[PDB]
From Swiss-Prot, chains A, B:
Keywords, comma-separated and alphabetical: Acetylcholine receptor inhibiting toxin, Disulfide bond, Ion channel impairing toxin, Neurotoxin, Postsynaptic neurotoxin, Secreted, Signal, Toxin
The keyword Protein biosynthesis is assigned to this record: no
Tissue: Expressed by the venom gland.
Cellular component annotations (GO), alphabetically ordered: extracellular region
Subunit field text: Homodimer; non-covalently linked.
Family from the record: Belongs to the three-finger toxin family. Short-chain subfamily. Orphan group VIII (haditoxin) sub-subfamily.
Keyword DNA damage: no
Compartment(s) where it occurs, according to its Swiss-Prot or TrEMBL record: Secreted
Protein name stated in the entry: Haditoxin
Coiled coil spans: none
Single annotated GO MF: toxin activity
Full-protein interval shown: 22 to 86 of 86
Role description: Antagonist of muscle (alpha-1-beta-1-delta-epsilon/CHRNA1-CHRNB1-CHRND-CHRNE) and neuronal (alpha-7/CHRNA7, alpha-3-beta-2/CHRNA3-CHRNB2, alpha-4-beta-2/CHRNA4-CHRNB2) nicotinic acetylcholine receptors (nAChR). The highest affinity is for human alpha-7/CHRNA7 nAChRs (IC(50)=180 nM), compared to human alpha-1-beta-1-delta-epsilon/CHRNA1-CHRNB1-CHRND-CHRNE nAChR (IC(50)= 550 nM), alpha-3-beta-2/CHRNA3-CHRNB2 nAChR (IC(50)=500 nM), and alpha-4-beta-2/CHRNA4-CHRNB2 nAChR (IC(50)=2.6 uM).
S-S bonds: C3-C24, C17-C41, C45-C57, C58-C63
Amino acid sequence: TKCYNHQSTTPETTEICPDSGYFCYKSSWIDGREGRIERGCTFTCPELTPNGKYVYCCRRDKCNQ
Amino acid sequence: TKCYNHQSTTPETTEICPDSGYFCYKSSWIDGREGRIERGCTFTCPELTPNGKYVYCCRRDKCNQ
């Protein structure tokens, strides 16, 4: 799998995941008042933290824009 | 928190979540060849299993259509 891995609204980048068990994720949260997004490869979908807005985990190449 | 809780393509239904540590999810997976969707309230974001297409966890009312 290939996934986006750029943070927030930084310029788009991709990474090729380490193995076939990986999928993509996109996680958005508020830190104090500041919205941020993390993107990348993972083999496990992250928990939605108390200040998290959403977590999206998806299997298909570049699904996590 | 009010989340959709209808399965797959059934008529929309909602539920009001029990406690404050609750958010909504939508989970899409394949059972054999058949696509299925589960929606509802949760306090933990579901794992994306090998047969899953995506998991989406979100906080806003009706965010998980």
